[PDB]
Amino acid sequence: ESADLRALAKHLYDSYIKSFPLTKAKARAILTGKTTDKSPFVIYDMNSLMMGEDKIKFKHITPLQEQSKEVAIRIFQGCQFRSVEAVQEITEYAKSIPGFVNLDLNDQVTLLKYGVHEIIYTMLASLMNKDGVLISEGQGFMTREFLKSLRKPFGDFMEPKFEFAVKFNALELDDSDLAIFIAVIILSGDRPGLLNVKPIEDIQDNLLQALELQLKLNHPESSQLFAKLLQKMTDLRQIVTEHVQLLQVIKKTETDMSLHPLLQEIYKDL
């Protein structure tokens, strides 16, 4: 019954709104302007970066950074904090996916461990355009060029995310679509170490039926969007793995920079 699939779609969309503070709808409204209510301050260099901690609420350093927690690292631990935060949000969203909390605890943990980062990059695309990315709840916007101008290692941490974002955004998905897609990503019965794969795939199949119907009704004129979106699932994997390696480089060149335990545990990955 397509009626049950539509109900599942509403339910997941409802929990998504309740779980994530910055939706794509709000992100796009901020990025496309035509507003005076929520224009973001733009960080495109050191100066604007310095001033940035004056317009928005940031817990870092405004002045010089060379001999005092450099700008790169300063911005790195910023993402680190937001990431750890996105993990708790995604975890809260996961619990709302029918059947998720009824699964083996070890598997719930495993699904989150391998799914969180893939969800993070998928949603991060909502905050991006070819020129940059929204930061701190959308009050700021950090230019793509500025990020690429960071120190050797950090300078290329985001470039691959932008490349993925521009392609992914071309699909023109809205929040109601992403809510089901994100749920599909989580219930991947092919994650390493899964104990009971069958119950997991039974849920994903239900979610896939919901996603398919949702895309057919929401994008009547977009042929094979469903297949096209599912293929994007391969780009995420690449992003994640790619991210992991670079992370290993940081650890060796920045033995003074710390990583949050949570994030550190989720990698043992890949």
Ligand X SMILES: CCCCCCCN(CCc1ccc(O[C@@](C)(CC)C(=O)O)cc1)c1nc2ccccc2o1
Binding site for rosiglitazone: residue ranges?
80-83, 117, 243, 267
Q: Which stretch binds its own copies (CB under 8 A): 24-32, 57-65, 129-137, 221-229?
A: 221-229
Query: Shortest CA distance to 9 belongs to which of 213, 220, 216, 233?
Result: 213
Check binding of 121 to its own copies (CB under 8 A): no
Say how many Å lie between the first and final Cα of the chain, rounded: 38
Choice from 234, 245, 252, 255 touching its own copies (CB under 8 A): 234
Name which of 75 and 185 has its Cβ closer to its own copies.
185
Check binding of 245 to its own copies (CB under 8 A): no
Which of the choices its own copies, ligand X, none does residue 266 contact, using the CB cut-off of 5 to 8 A by kind?
none
Choice from 39, 238, 258, 264 touching its own copies (CB under 8 A): 238
Name which of 135 and 194 has its Cβ closer to ligand X.
135
- Cα–Cα distances (Å) from 51 to 59, 61, 74, 85, in that order, read 13, 11, 15, 25
Characterize the bridge pairing of strands 41-43 and 140-143: parallel
φ/ψ of 14, rounded to 5, equals -60, -45
Name which of 55 and 82 has its Cβ closer to ligand X.
82
Query: Shortest CA distance to 45 belongs to which of 160, 124, 156, 141?
Result: 141
Name which of 77 and 209 has its Cβ closer to its own copies.
209
Residue 136 CA to residue 122 CA, distance in Å, equals 18
Q: How far is the CB of 167 from its own copies (least distance, A)?
A: 7
Structure tokens at 116: 């969180």
Check binding of 251 to its own copies (CB under 8 A): no
Choice from 82, 148, 191, 232 touching ligand X (CB under 6 A): 82
Choice from 6, 78, 96, 160 touching ligand X (CB under 6 A): 78
Name which of 27 and 210 has its Cβ closer to its own copies.
210
Name which of 119 and 187 has its Cβ closer to ligand X.
119
According to CB under 6 A, which residues from 88 to 127 bind ligand X? 89-90, 119-120, 123-124
Cα-based angle 91, 96, 100 (whole degrees, multiple of 5)? 80
What is the residue-wise DSSP string for 122-165? Answer: HHHGGGEETTEEEEGGGTEEEEHHHHHTS-TTGGGSSHHHHHHH
Residues across the chain? 270
Q: Which stretch binds its own copies (CB under 8 A): 3-11, 136-144, 174-182, 203-211?
A: 203-211
* Interacting residue ranges for ligand X, rule: CB under 6 A: 20, 76, 78-80, 82-83, 86, 89-90, 119-120, 123-124, 135, 247, 263
